[PDB]
């Protein structure tokens, strides 16, 4: 049981009366009530908010809801379903954004470049082969127990 007129058909126009009725319908600031604009993406006449909303609103303001950072009459932001704490914490970053991404990708490229240097320049120790007895260990490779001997021996130094 609810009033049909408190739903949301149509976009913003007309600019006096539909903005007035929607601002009184959603209870926000009147001139700062935003349509998207009429982008044709559905979206009706629903508001747009500053998109971060959760690692702002510090828990010492002591509103109603414990973890939604909500207070039961709010715009109920269109992208709240991506914005909830436990999902995306839009904290103010400790340094920057460009600084973070550039230093991270540069360090990964530096390590992989020197990994290619490691792949092309091995190390070794002044060591030859082992000396397996039966022609580099016949009968413990693939087999042929009566067919294929290939005579090559070991010589001492």
């Amino acid at each position: 049981s609810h009033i049909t007129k408190d739903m949301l058909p149509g976009p913003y126009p007309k600019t006096p009366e539909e903005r007035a009725a929607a601002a009184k319908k959603y209870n926000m600031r009147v001139e700062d009530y935003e349509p998207y604009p009429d982008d044709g993406m559905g979206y009706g006449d629903y508001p747009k908010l500053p998109d971060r909303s959760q690692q702002e609103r510090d828990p010492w303001y002591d509103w109603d809801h414990p973890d939604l950072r909500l207070n039961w009459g709010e715009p109920m932001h269109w992208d709240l379903d991506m914005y909830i704490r436990n999902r995306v914490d839009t904290s103010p970053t400790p340094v920057n954004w460009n600084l973070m991404c550039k230093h991270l990708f540069g360090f990964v490229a530096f390590m992989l470049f020197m990994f290619w240097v490691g792949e092309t320049y091995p190390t070794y120790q002044p060591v030859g082969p082992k000396q397996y007895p039966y022609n580099n260990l016949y009968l413990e490779r693939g087999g042929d127990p009566n067919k294929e001997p290939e005579p090559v021996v070991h010589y001492e130094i």
């Binding site: 809801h65 414990p66 973890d67 939604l68 379903d81 991506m82 436990n86």
Partner: protein, 459 residues
């Protein structure tokens, strides 16, 4: 099975001529009687299928589905009170008898020896569920939902009739056995292309495929609970069963024209696991989860491999159980808060303390927890499809990851973290609801112990 059919008819009129406050006990008792009675059928021995004269037969493709439906009936009925309990005596008897007549047509459908009979009993499955969801659709566009359901199911399913009469008057009668025997290959003409497109298109609509999967979510968010469970489990797995039947004919053209359906099913399976990650409206997430599982089923049916058929019927049975359970828990939460939205029902770890254990167990069956039958199905699908195309394991594993993700997300979203301290109307959990929990999951684990029953005819 006529000894199982005549108590399905004669289980009806007792519900009419029973006195008041006594229909419930009688229906439940006699339903469980017939549950054991047709559990006695299971003697499918070795080489052949088992037959009964000109109407009935049984592979392993039909017997666990049959036992599943007759298991579903007390669960079906026993979920279906407390939202129509205070309604009228005549209308309530009408509702229960309507469910019983629905299941009679279901058993006719699962033991359909012929295929014209299968089409008739297919739309006999169609018709009563319309009446049930439209009388008790519980919300505001039950009109719209029933209308989409009826026109999609007919206008997909209808040219299947003309294709089957065409097969009728080109190869004699439409027994399953002669079609096993008098089959001959049908080459890559265009007439075979349109015939295969007609039959597989009707069944694509039934599953649903991703191209017409808007059919499903309205039909679940605006259905009562018994119609929801029957719709989901029995109708979608019956569609898969019918495809498993009639894919025996038309060997060589499915090599050509099977390409876009598998493609659409794979990519839309991924898009469906994307769509049930971010929505509200707690009921509908399981509906899109069922869309993704049936897309997985569809990949399994069209790739035509014995591993694929065994894992496919395994996935059918396991997903039927898990989806019916999770719909029942959604009904329990809506009995609590009268909302159907997700962000209102929060917390509930202290409150309803052992309901969380059944939520967790259901989310782990939908996880693909590994001894569960769900993972047996998904695993053998992955094995068969990796034999089929050897690079397609990307979408299978990404489906696995996002499927576990949204299942566990719907678990820890609704029922983890904080009570919203304004509710005042949750009650400690009723013995009926927990009885339905034990009705779901104890036969699932006892099936998990000895699962050599439920595998396909290519065992």
């Amino acid at each position: 099975m006529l000894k199982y059919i005549i108590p399905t008819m004669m289980l009806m009129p007792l519900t009419w001529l029973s006195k008041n406050s006594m229909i419930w006990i009688n229906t439940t008792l006699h339903s469980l009687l017939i549950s054991l009675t047709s559990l006695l059928l299971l003697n499918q021995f070795g080489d052949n299928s088992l037959n009964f004269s000109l109407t009935f037969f049984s592979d392993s493709l039909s017997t666990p589905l049959l036992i599943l439906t007759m298991w579903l009936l007390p669960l079906m009925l026993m979920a279906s009170q407390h939202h129509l309990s205070k309604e009228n005596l005549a209308r309530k008897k009408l509702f229960i008898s309507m469910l019983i007549l629905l299941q009679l047509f279901l058993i006719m459908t699962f033991t359909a020896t012929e295929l014209i009979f299968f089409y008739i009993m297919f739309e006999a499955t169609l018709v009563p569920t319309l009446i049930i969801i439209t009388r008790w659709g519980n919300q505001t566009e039950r009109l719209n939902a029933g209308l989409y359901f009826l026109f999609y199911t007919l206008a997909g399913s209808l040219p299947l009739l003309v294709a089957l009469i065409y097969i009728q008057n080109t190869m004699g009668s439409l027994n399953f056995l002669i079609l096993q025997y008098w089959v001959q290959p049908m080459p890559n003409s265009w007439s075979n292309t349109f015939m295969w497109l007609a039959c597989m298109m009707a069944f694509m609509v039934k599953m649903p495929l991703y191209g017409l999967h808007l059919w499903l979510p309205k039909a679940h968010v605006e259905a009562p609970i018994a119609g929801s469970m029957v719709l989901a489990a029995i109708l979608l797995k019956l569609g898969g069963y019918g495809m498993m039947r009639i894919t025996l004919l038309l060997n060589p053209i499915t090599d050509f024209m099977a390409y876009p359906f598998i493609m659409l099913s794979l990519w839309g399976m991924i898009m469906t696991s994307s769509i049930c990650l971010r929505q509200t409206d707690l009921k509908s997430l399981i509906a899109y989860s069922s869309v993704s599982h049936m897309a997985l089923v569809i990949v399994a049916i069209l790739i035509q491999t014995p591993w694929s058929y065994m894992g496919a019927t395994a996935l059918m049975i396991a997903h039927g159980l898990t989806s019916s359970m999770l719909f029942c828990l959604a009904n329990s939460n809506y009995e609590r808060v009268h909302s159907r939205t997700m962000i209102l029902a929060r917390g509930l770890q202290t409150l309803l303390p052992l309901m969380a254990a059944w939520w967790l167990l259901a989310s782990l069956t939908n996880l693909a927890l590994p001894p569960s039958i769900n993972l047996i199905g998904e695993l053998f699908v992955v094995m068969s499809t990796f034999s089929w195309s050897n690079i397609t394991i990307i979408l299978m594993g990404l489906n696995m990851v996002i499927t576990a993700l949204y299942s566990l997300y719907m678990l820890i979203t609704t029922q983890r973290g904080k009570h919203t301290h304004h509710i005042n109307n949750i009650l400690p959990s009723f013995t009926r609801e927990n009885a339905l929990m034990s009705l779901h999951m104890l036969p699932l684990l006892l099936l998990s112990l000895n699962p050599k029953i439920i595998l396909g005819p290519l065992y």
